[PDB]
Amino acid sequence: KFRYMPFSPAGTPFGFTDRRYLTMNEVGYVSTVKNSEQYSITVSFFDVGRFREYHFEDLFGYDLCFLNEKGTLFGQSKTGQIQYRPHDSIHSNWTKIIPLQAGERITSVAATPVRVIVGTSLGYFRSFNQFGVPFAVEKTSPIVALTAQNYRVFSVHYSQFHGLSYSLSELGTSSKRYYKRECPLPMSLPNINSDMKKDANLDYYNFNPMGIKSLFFSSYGDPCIFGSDNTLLLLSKWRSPEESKWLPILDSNMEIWKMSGGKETTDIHVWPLALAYDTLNCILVKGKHIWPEFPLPLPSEMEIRMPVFVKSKLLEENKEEDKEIQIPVSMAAEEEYLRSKVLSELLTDTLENDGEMYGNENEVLAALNGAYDKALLRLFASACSDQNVEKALSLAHELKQDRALTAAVKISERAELPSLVKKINNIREARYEQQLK
Amino acid sequence: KFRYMPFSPAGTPFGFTDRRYLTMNEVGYVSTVKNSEQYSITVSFFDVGRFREYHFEDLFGYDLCFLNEKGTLFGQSKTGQIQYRPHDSIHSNWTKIIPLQAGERITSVAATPVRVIVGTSLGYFRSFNQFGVPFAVEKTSPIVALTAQNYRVFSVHYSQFHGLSYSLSELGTSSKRYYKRECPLPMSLPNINSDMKKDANLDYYNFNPMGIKSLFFSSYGDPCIFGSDNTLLLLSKWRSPEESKWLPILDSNMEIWKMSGGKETTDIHVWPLALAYDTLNCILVKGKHIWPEFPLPLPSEMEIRMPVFVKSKLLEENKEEDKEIQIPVSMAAEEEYLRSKVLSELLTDTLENDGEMYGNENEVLAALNGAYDKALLRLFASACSDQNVEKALSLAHELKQDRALTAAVKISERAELPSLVKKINNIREARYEQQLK
Amino acid sequence: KFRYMPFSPAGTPFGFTDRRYLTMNEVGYVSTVKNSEQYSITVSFFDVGRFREYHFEDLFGYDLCFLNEKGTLFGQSKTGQIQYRPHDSIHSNWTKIIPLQAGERITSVAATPVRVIVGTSLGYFRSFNQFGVPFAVEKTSPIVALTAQNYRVFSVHYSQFHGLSYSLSELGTSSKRYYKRECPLPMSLPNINSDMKKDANLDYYNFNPMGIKSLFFSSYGDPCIFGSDNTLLLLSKWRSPEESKWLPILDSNMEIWKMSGGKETTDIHVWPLALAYDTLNCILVKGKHIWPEFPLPLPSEMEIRMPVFVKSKLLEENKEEDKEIQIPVSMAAEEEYLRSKVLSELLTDTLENDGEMYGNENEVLAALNGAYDKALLRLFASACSDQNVEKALSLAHELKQDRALTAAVKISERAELPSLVKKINNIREARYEQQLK
């Protein structure tokens, strides 16, 4: 049966040892070691230029931790004791102890540049400024996870009596705004496997009874989460509630299956870190325990791809021993067109609302549009070679540039389809009129 | 423990037989029979003047099926194979295989002249054109039922944790719009009752544990559904954000009870087909097996009626007794005024947004207004006969026509209620003043 | 196994006795006594001078009851019989019988000067006029509680397969408008405390499985509820459904604990009746019978106070031991500023939407503003004593009167913080510019 527990982004259990990771993100990670009745904590950065790695001793046994590029926040789930540490020396650290009801415990904590947030098993929400001045208290569903990027904050909530849900908000200093409040979440649960399989990974489920492996904002503020099924999900169109939707953008298991030559190397596990545009930052872990250890192994990089393939069909198409399986060009072109379309739309929405950060992202969008038409031309040519004029004509509507339509005319000539040459030229003339208008 | 299962609208189980119906609607019905290790499928139409009945042999075990006026769609929940057959010879039959995960199955499918849709147990939504060209993939709760009309799509979902929910959306040519997204669905549930372990009942809930029998859009494009309790439910005010609500518009059990003479003829069941104005198209099934048998019985029709009825009062008022029980004028007038008001409002919404779809609705609307005032005049006269001036005056405010108020004045005079005559004359004067503005 | 119930707010069980209360509120209370297979009902008032107390014999077993300033409504959940009794004799006492399905029962009823509502175990909503004339019928999740004020109605719904949830609507002359419908309720169910099923408690929860003592609108028309957490909850931002949030505004366990000198006495309980501005109106209950008994005690009053203290720290700060704890200035000023802020905001919403309901609220709001700035000045002075320039400056931004800013300048000078003096006067200049603009 379910029970409430604390969490922090991508921590590890102690396992057999006296040390563990408390949390990880793109900026860095935090670790701690137990020394009889005391603890020692260490803070690490990937930007070695910008920051200094440092350490200090904890007597109170913190079990909660949250990191950003301004400071680190620490908490104790039973005693209610908390501490915030800026990265600078100038603003000295400060501490507080929060009231708790009998058996109540803190489940998660998070912080913006000016806001501090605490949640509990009994569904109480409390908030303070960067100097601990209390602002407000609210009563909600029990919270299980929290994350933030500048003023944008993303929350997850769960109850036996209300289901699984999420919230999205922006703590603007001009004003605070809610985009979603405890709306239903479609995430894949792990409980059936935990109850039936008896896999001796039970310690991980004790450590993380929700099985939510990690969650973070993209490099452009999109909300993202990695499921217990080892799939990456991203929320699209969040700015428009009648169009907002959840998208499955990468399955790790399918990648390892292809990488192994179509084999079941279950000894390999993927530990996610952060999402950089189109590429996942992750650790590839091997052996008994599905999470990394010390000293930290180097990260890896991996691209997202749409779920379109089938194992049996690809085995049939395929049919040195570990060679990665060969794929039909139709699947590759189809997947590219879908991936190009989704990427372009997300980038377009980002530019439409938040603009360019660097001054060149429009060029990437142009490249995506070129890739999109290129993929469609290959699929179109396949339809023409099959002499399916109806399907080829339907595909021709989706092409953007007249360069591509001209190429489609040449392709139709090679296919010896003058009817399709005619109808494409009708479309080109119609679209030329629309361009003249 | 619970297991998700596939569904097709108004299809039957096998029973203790080698044959069943896959789906049935206003266009036609699909039936199949076992022939050794194969099955023969027949597509029959209620208009074989427009259409042609045809048949073929199924070697795939297509356990899902959907019928429209363009063609028939077939699907296999385990293998993921699908097939579409246009009724015409202008366009070809074609097949495709959907990329299902291990443990996944397709729960239902739908097709319109612009789109083809697939849903799965693991909550994956996939969409294609009528040639199989793919468009997108989306994630929801586990999907359990589907139906569509042109661009409008109505979906039902179920979770052990989020409960029962529905979504209503339109694949608009600009973009996909959600009108409602996984909002809770209010249907009654049978399975907790031990009485459902009767043989005929148990087979249906093994075949269809949801207990739904069918779901479809009205003759005016509004969602409708027929559930385990044999009540027809219609979503009203769906075009209004703050007013959308589910209305119980027909209790078939009550109609059978009255029409049987006030009798408990549980040997009779109703199989729904489609809704046309105030009248439902259905099959009246008789015997132990609650689903229609072979060869298919004939179409029947039943009117929607408001739930005013009390058995004991109707028996007392009524007291060859198999003939339908008498209804008092008060009950008849009350039920008519409610039904007239409901029908007028639904039709008004239709004409304001969908226009005259059939070219006679202004005439129906005028008749409904006359029926509405006439029913209120009956109730008004009853209040006047009771000498209740306040109740009569309140009923007078509900009348629309000044002609109705003229009738009400004369009724008030003959009821010897001069105070009511004066007050109605004040109302008539006020309304005439308002008409002069 | 769970079971649905009929219910009425603030009534009581019998215990083992021959008498109980059916409902209680600030206007009055309804009590009844068993006379063999007949019952005597009495309607009593906290102004019996305006409203005649009256009593009559119930030969029906009315198990539902609702009281207002015009009359009392009674209901029989099994037979469907209902009866309305005006307190005057200008309006008649009248009776009606409502249709019910097999095993269906009326779960709750409500009545106002403009609307009447009935709910059932099968989730059917029915609405009527003050004469019992029907208006509409609707299907919902199963209804467990109802309350109303003018056209505004609040409802609670529950199912194991849809969760615990509420609806807020206004049954206006234009139409029934939904502010929220079947939205999740953030309240702790009593059965969470499964191990507390002692005999005395078990009788009460068999009488009231929901545990809620009452639910009502504030003196300012805001929904409020009191649950098994022994805490009063108020819905904020209800007039703006994008922004709605539940607030815990008073814990009776904390108050009784403090009032006992900070002691765990197991002997006194609070029975809520209504919330009037900052003060709960309630009856104090003592001993094993956690429900009030006969003769009814005289009403009591208790102020709302925010849940912002730690028990152990309060005891240590306090260190005649039964006298209520001496609270530090910091804690007192903290809670004062939060309570002042909450009250000012809620009253602002009241007056901006519904205007002055009593004709003096501007004075109350001005008094709250004075209390707010004075509380902040205490906290500011404490921060200056700690010499936290940043926290002191942050507190300065939250003051509202330039008099308080001037006092802050004097405090800063006494604290010998010239930088803070300079920056405060920069703020005063900025606010003077805002005052000039």
Place this chain on the structure above:
Amino acid sequence: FDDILGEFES
């Protein structure tokens, strides 16, 4: 009385 509803019918 029904005759008046007859007038409203006519």
